[PDB]
Design a protein around this ligand. Sequence first.
Ligand code: BCL
Ligand code: BCL
Ligand code: BCL
Ligand code: BCL
Ligand code: BCL
Ligand code: BCL
Ligand code: BCL
Ligand SMILES: COC(C)(C)CCC/C(C)=C/C=C/C(C)=C/C=C/C(C)=C/C=C\C=C(C)\C=C\C=C(C)\C=C\C=C(/C)CCCC(C)(C)OC
Ligand SMILES: CCCCCCCCCCCCCCCCCC
Ligand SMILES: [Ca+2]
Ligand SMILES: [Ca+2]
Ligand SMILES: [Ca+2]
Ligand SMILES: [Fe+3]
Ligand SMILES: [Mg+2]
Lengths: 44, 43, 41, 41, 42, 257, 73, 72, 73, 42, 272, 318
Amino acid sequence: EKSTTGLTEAESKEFHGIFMASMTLWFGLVVLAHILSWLYRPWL
Amino acid sequence: KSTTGLTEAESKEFHGIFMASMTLWFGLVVLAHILSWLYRPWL
Amino acid sequence: TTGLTEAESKEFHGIFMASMTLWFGLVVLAHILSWLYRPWL
Amino acid sequence: TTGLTEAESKEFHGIFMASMTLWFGLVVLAHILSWLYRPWL
Amino acid sequence: STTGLTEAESKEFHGIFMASMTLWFGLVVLAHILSWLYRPWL
Amino acid sequence: EFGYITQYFDLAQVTLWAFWLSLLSVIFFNRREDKREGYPQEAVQIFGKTILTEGFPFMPAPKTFKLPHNGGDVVKPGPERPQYDFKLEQVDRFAGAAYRPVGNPMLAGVGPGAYAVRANKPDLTNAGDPRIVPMRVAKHFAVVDKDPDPRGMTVIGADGQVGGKVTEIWVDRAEPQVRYLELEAGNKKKVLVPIALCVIKGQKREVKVRSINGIHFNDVPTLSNYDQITLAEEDKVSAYYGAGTLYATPNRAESVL
Amino acid sequence: MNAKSFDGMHKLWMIMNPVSTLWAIFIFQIFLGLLIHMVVLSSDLNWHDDQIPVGYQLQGETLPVNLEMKAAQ
Amino acid sequence: NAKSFDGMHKLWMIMNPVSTLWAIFIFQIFLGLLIHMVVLSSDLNWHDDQIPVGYQLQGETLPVNLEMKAAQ
Amino acid sequence: MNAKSFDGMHKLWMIMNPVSTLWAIFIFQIFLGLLIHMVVLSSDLNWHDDQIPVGYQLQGETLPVNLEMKAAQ
Amino acid sequence: PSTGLTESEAKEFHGLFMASMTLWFGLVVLAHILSWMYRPWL
Amino acid sequence: ALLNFEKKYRVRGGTLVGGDLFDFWVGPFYVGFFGVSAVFFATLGTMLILFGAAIGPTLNIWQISIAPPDLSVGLGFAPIREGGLWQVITICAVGAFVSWALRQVEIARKLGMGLHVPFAFSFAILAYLTLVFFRPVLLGAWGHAFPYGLFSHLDWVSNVGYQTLHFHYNPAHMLAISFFFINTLALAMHGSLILSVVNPQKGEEVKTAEHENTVFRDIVGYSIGALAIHRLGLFLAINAAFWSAVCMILTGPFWTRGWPEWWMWWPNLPIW
Amino acid sequence: PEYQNIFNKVQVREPAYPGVELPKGSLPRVGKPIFSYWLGKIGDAQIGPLYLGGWGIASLISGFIALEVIGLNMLASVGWDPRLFLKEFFWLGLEPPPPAYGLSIPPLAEGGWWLIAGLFLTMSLLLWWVRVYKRAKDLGMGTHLSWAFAVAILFFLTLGFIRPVLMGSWGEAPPFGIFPHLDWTAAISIRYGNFYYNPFHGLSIAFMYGSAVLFAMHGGTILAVSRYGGDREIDQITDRGTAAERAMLFWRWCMGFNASMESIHRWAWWFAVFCIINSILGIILTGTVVDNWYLWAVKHGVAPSYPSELTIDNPYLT
Ligand code: BCL
Ligand code: BCL
Ligand code: BCL
Ligand code: BCL
Ligand code: BCL
Ligand code: BCL
Ligand code: BCL
Ligand SMILES: COC(C)(C)CCC/C(C)=C/C=C/C(C)=C/C=C/C(C)=C/C=C\C=C(C)\C=C\C=C(C)\C=C\C=C(/C)CCCC(C)(C)OC
Ligand SMILES: CCCCCCCCCCCCCCCCCC
Ligand SMILES: [Ca+2]
Ligand SMILES: [Ca+2]
Ligand SMILES: [Ca+2]
Ligand SMILES: [Fe+3]
Ligand SMILES: [Mg+2]
């Protein structure tokens, strides 16, 4: 009846772990880029 | 009858997490606006 | 692939090469006459 | 994939390389003549 | 085996592919050295 | 100076020539693809001899269609199946004269009543089932209300007389739509009529078939098995209804003015 | 190695069709020939209209017979 | 960092070699035409730069052509 | 976590097709290469038309042979 | 296995993918060092 | 010459005028009463175009021109050298076009099929008659029609367009152009789809109707069907022709300002 | 009269068809199919489902970013008023940079938004190209629909990117409006001396007229033999019936030659593609090679020469 993706609960836990790790790393790199840009050419 | 296949327990679970997430999002919005008002007041 | 044997291909090739040589000879002659009449380089 | 055996491929390759070399020779000759007549660089 | 090539056939193809690509890049480098000698652009 | 000229030859000119040559060359290839059906043609000579000619440009080399579900190979241009047995008399003694049917024009298979000789297999779906079937074999179909269900109506036949009554609908499973109406005729046979030759009046509860007359519904060709139809049978049925457009009344082939 | 690395090259024609390749090469060469001739004709290197070794339309306009006819008009 | 590229030859077990060859060749021809056209549209153009000499100008000032243009 | 958080990562290719991904990456890289070259050519950093280390069309217009021919007309 | 690769095949592919990406980024860095030496933009 | 299968279909009957006298073929063509008429009128019209080129300044193919009368002739009869030749040729043209349509009707009756093609041809004929008959009559002069010449009817088109300052803002013109563009798009997609289904990827079977539906539902979400695309085709082409006729009957007879000023009815609605 | 086969008189429903099975490794199709009675009067009644994969999502993100940009600039040009937006809608537009800026990137309210919208629309159409190609190829069909689409994309890029770059200005490209883009059409004809004397323009007009002619002819002919099963073209191709025979006799008798049931579709393909090929060729030469099409036509012996009778004095010569 209900919409499902075929993932069990263990597979979902696994995917979630790696997804959150990757997103955190990406945001870290973004923050670093903005600190460099502020040091070079402040916009506010 | 229109139905989603969720029972009442599943709906309760979904509702809990939905409300928590929406509250956190609105908190972040309020913080952004306080910073913007301190920097460049518009009214 | 074309149905020609090797003998038929040899025959065709003989006449094809003869004809092409004669054609190029006539072309060279036409250009010598044109150079004598109206040199372009 | 093409139905050619290895011997047929070797044969074709021999003649293909000979023909390409002759063609490039003629190209080089044409360019030497053009450089003698009208140098472009 | 998705392309039907075995591992030996793939090794063979890879050998010749790398040789050909190296030769092509060599010719490119030579063309650029001649062009720099004739008409330097930087 | 308003119209001074520097040089006569330009790029637009050359490019236009190139286009004239690129057309003039797709014409060639299309005209060659046009001749994979119906060729070589038959040219009649000075005193009646017939030869096969091929035209300009010449016919292409044969290509193959591989039909699905082991339906065989089709080579084109290739052989032809033999014509059946039409009888015709020429009207005037020259190669370009017209012909007259010899017997009963309705049952002759000449003129608008000619048909082709196709395979004796049904057309298939993507799953391997027969494509055109009655609505009792296809148990999932239903007529949308808002539309007149033709089952039950009568089949008035172009001179005002009754032909029979509609008893079944034949559907198309690959594209859901109606293709044939089945009816019981005056001599209690089951015959088909294509849906594209029927005007359906819901309130009169009639189906008007302008092609043939009422008594003509007794001689419509019949099917082998009534759970499917083959390509040959489709051709025969449709051609019989098309012969009536010129042969039903003796006045139909006779110069309006 | 640097000499034995092109040994199996002849096997190229076991995966590429020879007739199709020949036709493709010939057609491409003809197209490129036409294109380069047209590109060079549209530059300062043009050799039909450069009036070397002489201008022929100008030569026809100043023939003594044509000049004498144009004077009588 | 020298044993990192051992399994590379297996590339041709998932990519079709003939399709890849054709793709590479076609891309290279297109890029060749494009770069030649981009360089011909710049200050680096080598057909119209009149080096080592201008040929149309050379034809306009031949003594025969000059003497014919003077008679007009 | 934070030291061994990316150990499952190789499982990525059990949900994403490797050959499709390779092709997508290659095509995107070529498109981006063309785009960045065109964006930098349309700025003050342009390196084809800056006439450094010399202007070549201007060099051809002032050759002594061309100057002497243009004087004679 | 929505792609049909097992876990061993995925590990293999991942190894070579990461090596190739690292080499590519190395070449990019080298190109930018040369460009900075020739025409500094910041 | 006859096709492999042609002989059993060459029967007598089906005609409108004439009868058994003109019911024959000449080569592949079918003649009939209207075949004789059409060839008669085409030959006469062509020969008169050529003569009108002979009395002009040049026989260059691009620069021949036969022009209509002046506006002072009104709806009368012009001298032969100053407009009457144009009138005779424009009578021949109508005769030939209508003959063509009726011959089509005879052929379709003989083969047992519907009259859709002559019916669609009728709308081209109607557009021509709008440009040479209806618009001139409503404006009061034959000299409002176009001259017969390549390159010379284009000067007419240009100047007529600029008599309204900007002819792009004509509403029926916009609608007709919409139909023309959509028709070319539809024809490209239809051609491509049938070719693709009977010429599949190397070493595959001919595909089916389900494939035809699936491909467009995957790309776009809706598929119109194999019989409805033919309908959609007849529809788009006929509508293009129809709205062209309307746009020309509006220009001059029913509107004499600039065409941008018509549209002014919209921002002047008292509702914004 | 007789039934003309223009509308469906009786409709029938079965459960929706999900579609031919895709190769393994594919995403599912999104949407639950619905039925339209009014669409079923003229054609197929099912709407959906739809296939959204990698390339058709990147496309649709690009396209909607572009649409948001275009819409917002049109709305800023009236002062944000939606009432005025509806009132003057056919006159609004997003305008290209001033021609004096050349090929540089101008500031945002003086042509930079035009540049952004152009870039995003371009990327949208190229991603859609890849989608169309892969969708036809995964079902095992020939890729003929991608060739024609490629031609159309090339015409969009020619007028818009390639010609403005070859000229040296972004201000040579069309704006995004209705009446604004019509004004662009007229002005480019006026500046380069009369497009009626452009020969590629004449040839593309020949092929647009021909597209309308050919598709009226084909649509008519197949509706006229649909009583003999002619609307099912695949079977008439792989097993020629009486519908195809009558269809080809009609044209043979009428104009002396004919096509077959498969060949007419190649004629359609080419007539639709030559129109746009000549479009590209005519735009790419305008301005870059030819500066006045009327003077070109006069130099090559094409334009007629009306009698004069008068003399007008050019006041710049006096
Ligand atoms: C004055 C402004 C500054 C400037 C200010 C900033 C700021 C601020 C940022 C950037 C960021 C980026 N800049 Mg910058 N940048 C400048 C000039 C440039 C120029 C140039 C021609 O001048 C270029 C080509 C770049 C290009 C880039 C990209 C490397 C990066 C955008 C990543 C992205 O698109 O998401 C692609 C994202 C995905 C596909 C999803 C997530 C990525 C995952 C993990 C997989 C992708 C592979 C890999 C990680 C891709 C990125 C490579 C690097 C390792 C980050 N900048 C000037 C000098 N730039 C962004 C960045 O650093 O991100 C970290 C960023 O925040
Ligand atoms: C003068 C005006 C101020 C300004 C005033 C504001 C105000 C006020 C707000 C923002 C908000 C945003 N601004 Mg701001 N902003 C300015 C200039 C910028 C510039 C720039 C290039 O100049 C950029 C790139 C941004 C970008 C952003 C985004 C981060 C954010 C909108 C998020 C969104 O749409 O979620 C849509 C997506 C979802 C709902 C999905 C779920 C979210 C996902 C998972 C994460 C998205 C990013 C997240 C919120 C931040 C990272 C996580 C946290 C670090 C934990 N601003 C200037 C300086 N901006 C809004 C915001 O931050 O709210 C939180 C907001 O209220
Ligand atoms: C300044 C320029 C010169 C000029 C310079 C040249 C040059 C240079 C050449 C020609 C050539 C030709 N010129 Mg010239 N030509 C000029 C003016 C003319 C005029 C004219 C109205 O002014 C005409 C009608 C021609 C006509 C011709 C053709 C005979 C011939 C190209 C043949 C061809 O296309 O074969 C293509 C067709 C085929 C291959 C099909 C097969 C042919 C078969 C076998 C039979 C055809 C007969 C053949 C054409 C003639 C040979 C017969 C002999 C009497 C034995 N020239 C002016 C005066 N001309 C070409 C030539 O002479 O060819 C040898 C050539 O190289
Ligand atoms: C300033 C410029 C020079 C000039 C510079 C050059 C240069 C440089 C070259 C040419 C080349 C060619 N030039 Mg040139 N050329 C000039 C003016 C002309 C004029 C003219 C009307 O003015 C003409 C008609 C030609 C015609 C030709 C062709 C013969 C040849 C292109 C061949 C080709 O495309 O094959 C493509 C087709 C194929 C490969 C298909 C297969 C061909 C087969 C094998 C047979 C073809 C016969 C072959 C063309 C000639 C062989 C004759 C000998 C007896 C062997 N040039 C002016 C004077 N020209 C090219 C050439 O000579 O090649 C060797 C070349 O490199
Ligand atoms: C100021 C600028 C210079 C100039 C600078 C450069 C530079 C730099 C380069 C070229 C290159 C090329 N130049 Mg250049 N070039 C100039 C003027 C010209 C002119 C002319 C009419 O003015 C022409 C016709 C050419 C033509 C060529 C091609 C031979 C070559 C492009 C190959 C290619 O497209 O690969 C496309 C096709 C393939 C890759 C297919 C793969 C190979 C296949 C199997 C067969 C190809 C044979 C190959 C074309 C010829 C090399 C054979 C040798 C005789 C051994 N140049 C001017 C004078 N040119 C490129 C080159 O030489 O490559 C090594 C190159 O890097
Ligand atoms: C002022 C600015 C500088 C400049 C600054 C830069 C900078 C900075 C960069 C480049 C990069 C590139 N530049 Mg640059 N560049 C300039 C002028 C040029 C000119 C020219 C006509 O003027 C050309 C033709 C190039 C061409 C190139 C390409 C070689 C390269 C982009 C490749 C790519 O898109 O891969 C996309 C395709 C793929 C990723 C496919 C995947 C891998 C494939 C299978 C292998 C391809 C090999 C690759 C081309 C390198 C081969 C070299 C060998 C290792 C010897 N530049 C000017 C002088 N250029 C980039 C680069 O070099 O990358 C390393 C780069 O970072
Ligand atoms: C400055 C000029 C104006 C302009 C002024 C006009 C004028 C004035 C007219 C149009 C008309 C049209 N314009 Mg406008 N138009 C302009 C710009 C455009 C642009 C564009 C992209 O800018 C487009 C796409 C159009 C498109 C169109 C069409 C809507 C319409 C032409 C089709 C038609 O009439 O069919 C109708 C078909 C016919 C008339 C064909 C007749 C067919 C006959 C019966 C058969 C002949 C057979 C033959 C003799 C046989 C030869 C046989 C051989 C054996 C082969 N115009 C510019 C702005 N336009 C025309 C129109 O709408 O007329 C009704 C019209 O008069
Ligand atoms: C209020 O509305 C909201 C926001 C809510 C959304 C609603 C959206 C609406 C109503 C939109 C209405 C849109 C209309 C009417 C659009 C009209 C469009 C028309 C008719 C457009 C016609 C032609 C335009 C063309 C041909 C443009 C071509 C542009 C091109 C090819 C651009 C090329 C630029 C490129 C590739 C970028 C290069 C940039 C760079 C960075 C490389 O430069 C160096
Ligand atoms: C020998 C007896 C037959 C004579 C030849 C027939 C001549 C036909 C008359 C010419 C055309 C008629 C003019 C009008 C035709 C109808 C207009 C649509
Ligand atoms: Ca010369
Ligand atoms: Ca030079
Ligand atoms: Ca430089
Ligand atoms: Fe069709
Ligand atoms: Mg404007």
